[PDB]
Write a protein that binds this ligand. Structure first.
Ligand SMILES: NS(=O)(=O)c1ccccc1OC(F)F
Length: 435
């Protein structure tokens, strides 16, 4: 599978040994054939587990999640999906890798979709080989794939708020449970309910993942309350998954604003990945998967695919050519290649608003395309009254870089900048000119 012009999907079931067994064999063969190779990990947590599976082998780890002394003799680089896309966007030269390996290639974050688009286009061009490793490739319709040991699948009503009665099965469990919730705010409510009932709960989300995941190995716990981030290779020593089967969906309305629609059903790929956290030990059959809804193709019209197109339009490929999205996921957005291509100075602003401003791709694009410079924050306060960001049922206020107290009222409203307390605190720091 290492020959040029070939894109291979390694779709072995969850827990089949794609990372610990297959990946080191591919790396040895790539080193033997002198292929300049890139290994892409979804998160810093997967990069650390990859270093254990590849230990000894000459790999250059382009992440601070691993503390290794690189000899300078490595032809295999390892980095996160977001780092690969970020380096493509930045002026820095990225080697034209002969072999491109993506682990957890089902990741739907905009930078992962862009990385898939770029790589598959290089393969279509006949310039590279690629391997996409995932049990759930784009287009999967099977929510119940094979596992290392039989799983008990039970369709049941799953609580999405605190409860006083009616769900005895949840707390009448003596093992360890991983519970997938549609949002951080929904997880806070359930974790509070479980804590009041005497349970030890750990909460996981995109912004707290590396730090809080370590607690699942360093201490005893009864529940792990997590968003969809734990569908990306996160592994637990648990015997039950409780799955609300719901997620939030970012949606662009009238090309003017972004709302977080839902909670709505997850895709079959997400349901299979959430279920896949258990049934992994062949010596422990009978792990349970309790699910509270059906699946649907909620990736169609989801803002991440439009955001991936804004990223690929601003990545150099060859002269005026622009990378297409990976074919099985290209119909998820109505977008023409090149429509988001920015001129030099606006593109640099777009990259900085994402890299340093920490803004969502769509919002970074609106600011940069309007000809606004990175440090100009007047747009955070000159929007209509209905764009007022609310905190504790009262309009959010910040002190501007001028020393003036003003109501946070962005010219373009993206619900992701205030989806939880941590997001709004970061957006207030941005509006104030603190980064
Ligand atoms: N992939 S690797 O680092 O083992 C390698 C590949 C081709 C030549 C030399 C070499 O290593 C040596 F420099 F130590």
């Amino acid at each position: 599978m290492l020959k040029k012009k070939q894109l291979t999907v390694l779709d072995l079931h969850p827990g089949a040994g794609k990372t610990r067994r297959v990946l080191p064999e591919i790396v040895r063969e790539a080193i033997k054939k002198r292929l300049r190779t890139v290994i892409l990990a979804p998160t810093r947590v997967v990069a650390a587990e990859m270093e254990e599976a590849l230990r000894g082998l000459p790999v250059r780890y382009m992440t601070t999640a691993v503390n290794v002394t690189h000899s300078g003799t490595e032809i295999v680089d390892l980095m996160c999906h977001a780092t690969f896309t970020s380096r493509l966007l930045q002026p820095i030269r990225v080697p034209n890798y002969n072999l491109n390996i993506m682990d957890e290639a089902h990741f739907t974050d905009p930078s992962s979709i862009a990385a898939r688009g770029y790589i598959s286009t290089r393969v279509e061009m006949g310039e590279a080989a690629a391997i996409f490793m995932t049990a759930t490739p784009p287009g999967t319709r099977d929510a119940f794939p094979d596992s290392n040991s039989p799983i008990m699948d039970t369709e049941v009503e799953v609580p999405e708020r605190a409860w006083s009665s009616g769900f005895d099965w949840v707390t009448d469990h003596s093992g360890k449970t991983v519970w997938f919730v549609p949002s951080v705010r929904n997880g806070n409510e359930i974790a509070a309910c479980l804590t009041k009932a005497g349970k030890r709960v750990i909460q996981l989300s995109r912004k707290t993942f590396e730090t809080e995941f370590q607690k699942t190995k360093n201490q005893e716990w009864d529940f792990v309350i997590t968003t969809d981030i734990s569908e990306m290779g996160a592994n637990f020593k648990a015997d039950r998954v409780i799955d609300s089967r719901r997620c939030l969906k970012p949606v662009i309305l009238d090309g003017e604003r972004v709302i977080l629609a839902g909670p709505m059903p997850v895709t079959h790929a997400s349901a299979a990945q959430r279920r896949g956290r258990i049934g992994r030990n062949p010596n422990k059959p009978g792990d349970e998967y309790m699910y509270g809804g059906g699946c649907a193709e909620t990736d169609e019209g989801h803002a991440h695919w439009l955001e991936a197109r804004m990223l690929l339009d601003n990545i150099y490929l060859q002269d005026g050519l622009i990378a297409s999205l990976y074919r099985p996921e290209a119909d998820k957005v109505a977008a023409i290649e090149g429509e988001f291509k920015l001129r030099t100075e606006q593109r640099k602003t777009f990259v900085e608003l994402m890299k340093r401003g920490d803004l969502p791709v769509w919002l970074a694009y609106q600011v940069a395309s309007a000809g606004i410079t990175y440090t100009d924050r007047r747009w955070c306060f000159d929007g209509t009254t209905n764009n007022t960001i609310m905190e504790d049922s009262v309009p959010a206020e910040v002190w501007t870089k001028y020393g003036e107290k003003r109501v946070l009222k962005p010219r373009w409203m993206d619900a992701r900048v205030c989806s939880d307390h941590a997001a709004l605190k970061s957006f207030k720091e941005f509006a104030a000119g603190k980064r």
